[PDB]
Amino acid sequence: GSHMILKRHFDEKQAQLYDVIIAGGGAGGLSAAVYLARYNLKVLVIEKGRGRSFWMQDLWNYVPRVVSGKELIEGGKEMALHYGADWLNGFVEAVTDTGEEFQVRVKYRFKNSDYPVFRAKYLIAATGLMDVLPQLENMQNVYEYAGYNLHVCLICDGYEMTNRRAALIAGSEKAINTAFVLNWFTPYITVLTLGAYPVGDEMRAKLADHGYPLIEKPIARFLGKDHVMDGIEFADGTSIKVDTGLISMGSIRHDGYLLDLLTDGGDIVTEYDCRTSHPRVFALGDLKKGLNQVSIAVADGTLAATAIWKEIRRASAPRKWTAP
Amino acid sequence: SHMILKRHFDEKQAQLYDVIIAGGGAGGLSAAVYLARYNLKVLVIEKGRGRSFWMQDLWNYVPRVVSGKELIEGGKEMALHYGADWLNGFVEAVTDTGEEFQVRVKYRFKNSDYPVFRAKYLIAATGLMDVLPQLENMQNVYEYAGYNLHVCLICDGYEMTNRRAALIAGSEKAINTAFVLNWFTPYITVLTLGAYPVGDEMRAKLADHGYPLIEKPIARFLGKDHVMDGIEFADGTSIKVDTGLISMGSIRHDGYLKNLDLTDGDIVTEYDCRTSHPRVFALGDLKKGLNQVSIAVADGTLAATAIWKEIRRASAPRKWTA
Ligand SMILES: Cc1cc2nc3c(=O)[nH]c(=O)nc-3n(C[C@H](O)[C@H](O)[C@H](O)COP(=O)(O)OP(=O)(O)OC[C@H]3O[C@@H](n4cnc5c(N)ncnc54)[C@H](O)[C@@H]3O)c2cc1C
Ligand SMILES: Cc1cc2nc3c(=O)[nH]c(=O)nc-3n(C[C@H](O)[C@H](O)[C@H](O)COP(=O)(O)OP(=O)(O)OC[C@H]3O[C@@H](n4cnc5c(N)ncnc54)[C@H](O)[C@@H]3O)c2cc1C
Ligand SMILES: Cc1cc2nc3c(=O)[nH]c(=O)nc-3n(C[C@H](O)[C@H](O)[C@H](O)COP(=O)(O)OP(=O)(O)OC[C@H]3O[C@@H](n4cnc5c(N)ncnc54)[C@H](O)[C@@H]3O)c2cc1C
Ligand SMILES: Cc1cc2nc3c(=O)[nH]c(=O)nc-3n(C[C@H](O)[C@H](O)[C@H](O)COP(=O)(O)OP(=O)(O)OC[C@H]3O[C@@H](n4cnc5c(N)ncnc54)[C@H](O)[C@@H]3O)c2cc1C
Missing domain, CATH: 3.50.50.60 (FAD/NAD(P)-binding domain)
Incomplete structure (x- = not known):
């Protein structure tokens, strides 16, 4: 869907199985949502708000324009919705792997919070971190x-x-x-x-x-x-x-909802695909080993979305031009 | 942070840059702003009318949908603001003298000057053109x-x-x-x-x-x-x-790299974007991998940082003497 999820849609969306669920709607998560929405895949972005990018006053080294962190999220959010991504204002608590698909619990609302669970074949960890x-x-x-x-x-x-x-x-x-x-x-x-x-x-x-x-x-x-x-x-x-x-003073990792395993040396280890140790989950931006910049986070979302699209595409039946 | 005209060729040709970037596109411009923001001397050389220039709509590069012309114009301005040098020319050839690179550039279309600049490092970010x-x-x-x-x-x-x-x-x-x-x-x-x-x-x-x-x-x-x-x-x-x-395939903008050697269809690089030839990096469409703006910009970040780390680690510590 091309709309933000409110109270009514939980019953529908919980039954529906998304291709990928994106945790965190920042630089990397939004980039991945835009690519995935552009690949005609069902994707849901879950953003808590007041992220590390939001407090960035000036993005100095992200071509072509110098924007504030709020402008970055607002523009990328608008883009993701335009291309068909679903956006939810919530906090991701935990994930359960049943062999195939992931079950993602989300705290909706700060107090008296609903705990809807969403389904997806793949997961993208794009929650970044917060500076001390x-x-x-x-x-x-x-x-x-x-x-x-x-x-x-x-x-x-x-x-x-x-x-x-x-x-x-x-x-x-x-x-x-x-x-x-x-x-x-x-x-x-x-x-x-x-x-x-x-x-x-x-x-x-x-x-x-x-x-x-x-x-x-x-x-x-x-x-x-x-x-x-x-x-x-x-x-x-x-x-x-x-x-x-x-x-x-160090950084706080927003990796609660992450499962165990996932090799790391303080940060999750990923392949050039941004594919983590688990085959079905990808890590983006600040959560993975490497530079912690917006440029590399945006590129990470491009890499992850494409690796996911290739795996699904290569497993889907060819769309032929059938008789009218 | 100035654009090179007729006067500055003799001065800047004598100057040793830290890095020269061939091509002022998505990846090259990103590498330029990072290097300039590392307080390093960098020169970008752009021919014009590149692949990104012909891109009418950039759909999947957050946060704003811009045209390819808008992309280059903004990134160029940014690099200049931060201290990068920009030259309107075509890179013809490159020579590795063992301790530096000398890059000859055809300046102006007709009755063209052929100034040759110097740099310790080189970044190949000239991309390709679709057939x-x-x-x-x-x-x-x-x-x-x-x-x-x-x-x-x-x-x-x-x-x-x-x-x-x-x-x-x-x-x-x-x-x-x-x-x-x-x-x-x-x-x-x-x-x-x-x-x-x-x-x-x-x-x-x-x-x-x-x-x-x-x-x-x-x-x-x-x-x-x-x-x-x-x-x-x-x-x-x-x-x-x-x-x-x-x-219908693609033609590479890799003429000036003929002398150097560069394992290959495309140039192979490490995660740093470092090629086989020491002190030269390949970015974006020239290297093996996705051909997108997002990954090209990130490539410039990696190369610019890898260069900065090598120089920084090789420079003497700046102590407080007051
Ligand atoms: C003051 C400041 C200035 C900066 N300037 C620059 C700069 O000039 N250039 C640069 O490259 N970088 C800069 N950075 C860092 C840059 O913001 C990050 O490297 C970049 O945002 C990483 O993107 P990301 O998507 O990995 O994480 P983020 O952009 O932080 O995105 C993570 C998002 O996920 C959300 N989230 C986190 N956990 C959860 C959860 N459990 N459930 C739901 N949502 C969640 C957060 O609200 C956040 O919005 C700056 C940072 C600060 C603080
Ligand atoms: C450069 C910089 C500037 C900053 N400036 C400010 C500032 O001006 N003001 C400021 O307040 N902070 C600022 N911060 C961040 C600040 O340091 C703290 O991290 C922040 O105030 C605390 O966030 P929180 O209480 O929401 O913690 P969170 O970890 O966001 O919240 C904790 C719990 O609340 C729940 N929760 C969070 N979001 C949601 C949601 N959307 N829906 C349901 N449940 C949710 C989750 O269960 C979570 O476990 C800044 C940080 C940096 C790096
Ligand atoms: C119509 C169209 C639409 C596109 N849409 C998208 C999109 O939506 N999203 C996306 O991610 N990608 C898109 N692309 C591809 C995208 O343009 C490239 O992946 C991206 O620009 C890579 O940049 P680069 O730096 O590797 O090469 P570029 O940025 O394309 O070009 C490098 C620069 O080097 C210059 N140069 C080359 N040779 C020389 C020389 N000898 N001397 C001096 N300068 C030289 C060129 O003039 C050029 O300006 C599109 C391409 C086209 C044609
Ligand atoms: C989607 C798409 C749309 C396109 N649309 C157009 C279009 O509308 N119009 C169009 O013309 N092309 C377009 N192109 C590209 C076109 O196919 C040709 O590549 C181009 O038009 C002509 O290139 P050129 O002959 O100048 O080759 P170039 O390699 O650019 O020029 C050859 C010579 O010119 C000299 N030279 C070039 N620039 C400079 C400089 N700044 N200073 C000094 N010397 C220089 C060099 O010495 C070089 O040897 C498009 C391509 C794509 C993929």
Whole structure:
């Protein structure tokens, strides 16, 4: 269908068996939905909202136009519907494999939620992940600057950080090593560990050799005006002046609904097809091993949708021109 | 972030770029913005009137449906904004000196200058061009090629769904896409243009499927306002079709790569898009894999990052000395 699913259609759609069900309606999931809808296959996209792409203010490196994250989802959503994809505003809880097909439970609505289950021969895991954010009592203070000039991905915003006073909020001793990659863009790095883990002397000597100050105080407030951060204030009232920052605190994986198996080294392993260890499920974008960009996520959906279309097509009966 | 004119040839020819990108299409432009955004020196060289330029509607590239011209125009602007250099020229030849590449470019169509630029890395992103049916009045083919007379099944299969379709095959082997196109529409008419003999094996297979086989040459494509509605053959007869698919092969834009060596139909690459020849990457339509804009853009991201990682890891750490 070419319409969003509301309360009435659950009885119909639960009986109906989709060719593929897409979990997550972001960059990769929408691309896959558009391709699958364009291949005349039954596809349902399930999007919870407020995803990682939604908080992206400026998509800098996705040709041909610079768009916001909300514009990206809105345009791709519109496109998927236009081509015949079904879209549902819900959260995917779990999946059951019966040998053939998948059974996908979805929490509909935040409170007093319906738990409709949908059927599909294939599944596409395209739920991405969410970046960890420093924790303050007023998170609106963190939100005012996060995603603007307080960055979460080095490749996405490194260009705008060039030769600027930068603060690296590292969530672990390993995460401090991003200073030695961030320094490519700016050597004016201040490493902030938030008083969370003790730093080894090896790394302490390395930061000193490079001249990067190490501040192990907790954070209290981000200082800025009109979404442009200009400083960081610590618990004791003191502060530092920074023109930009990079959060390197790890990522949260939206892989609850995923089954077991599925080999990984922190992220699911996939073939050039984006086919995971399970033959019938494909992993897209940030969930799979590889770059975490919109370009590669969009391409992943193209790869997965085509591999699925080839398998179904090669198993379908030829459509002949029968007598009229 | 400037476009090269007459003055800048001598200066930029002396400069060693970090990478040169051959072809300013989907994949090349994506690689350009990433490299420029890695604060690396990159030069893009675009001839113009490429395959993507003739694409009228980009259907399956989120978030917006744009024309191929809009795609190149936007990506070009972006690359320039971020510091990439753009040259309007044709890449003629490439030499690997062991420590760098020298790329000669024909500048201007007539009375042309032949500046040769330098770079440590090279990205081959010149794609290919689809073969078209040959009529005396080629404007009649261009009138409909790219609108509803298609060249790529994956791109426009959706618009061909359950419509009277003509498959213009350039060879008996090419006729086999009818058995893939039938997924979208079974109302397929196979046209051989009377250029090659069809075997009875294939002749019987088309009959079993009910796909008419017409072995007459073509004379004119019938339509009005870029929407084809039929085909007229040499003998005066005609058929009515609402759409068609051209399957006559492709010519590669890989002339300048003759000197280099590049395992091959298409160039083979790793996941990085790295070719066999060290320090050169092949993107998009030149490499083995799907021929789509989405995967071409992603190819540029992979190559640009792989180059950045190699240089970054080879550069001295930038320490804070104040
Ligand atoms: C501030 C910021 C700026 C960025 N800038 C750039 C940039 O310039 N260039 C770039 O390439 N990348 C950028 N990124 C990262 C980029 O957004 C991701 O790499 C990209 O979106 C990955 O796409 P995806 O489809 O894998 O995941 P997403 O785009 O996050 O899509 C996942 C979607 O699935 C939904 N979802 C998740 N779990 C579930 C569930 N269980 N049920 C239902 N729905 C679910 C989410 O709501 C989300 O919308 C940026 C990120 C941030 C935070
Ligand atoms: C750069 C950046 C900027 C950000 N800015 C903001 C901001 O300004 N404001 C903000 O609030 N957050 C922001 N975030 C995200 C923030 O950090 C938290 O991740 C978010 O606020 C918490 O989401 P949630 O409570 O919906 O958790 P979720 O994991 O989305 O929800 C938890 C549970 O709720 C249920 N559920 C979720 N969605 C649905 C649905 N559609 N239907 C039914 N059930 C559902 C599921 O069962 C799930 O287990 C930002 C993140 C980044 C990286
Ligand atoms: C009518 C039509 C419709 C299409 N629709 C779709 C679609 O809906 N979706 C989709 O995914 N794909 C579509 N395609 C295919 C799509 O255009 C390609 O897959 C995509 O553009 C690949 O880009 P590329 O960078 O590999 O090559 P391109 O971007 O096509 O071209 C590379 C560039 O290099 C330049 N170049 C070549 N040789 C030289 C040289 N010697 N010197 C200088 N410059 C050179 C060319 O001029 C060109 O601009 C369509 C193609 C056509 C013809
Ligand atoms: C769907 C579709 C629709 C098409 N529609 C059209 C159409 O409407 N009109 C049309 O003309 N073609 C169209 N084409 C392509 C067409 O078939 C021919 O490829 C093209 O028209 C002529 O190419 P060319 O002879 O210039 O070859 P090219 O290789 O482009 O040119 C050959 C020579 O010109 C020189 N040269 C080219 N560009 C430059 C430059 N910027 N600077 C210096 N020297 C240069 C080079 O030195 C080269 O040796 C279409 C193709 C497809 C697939």
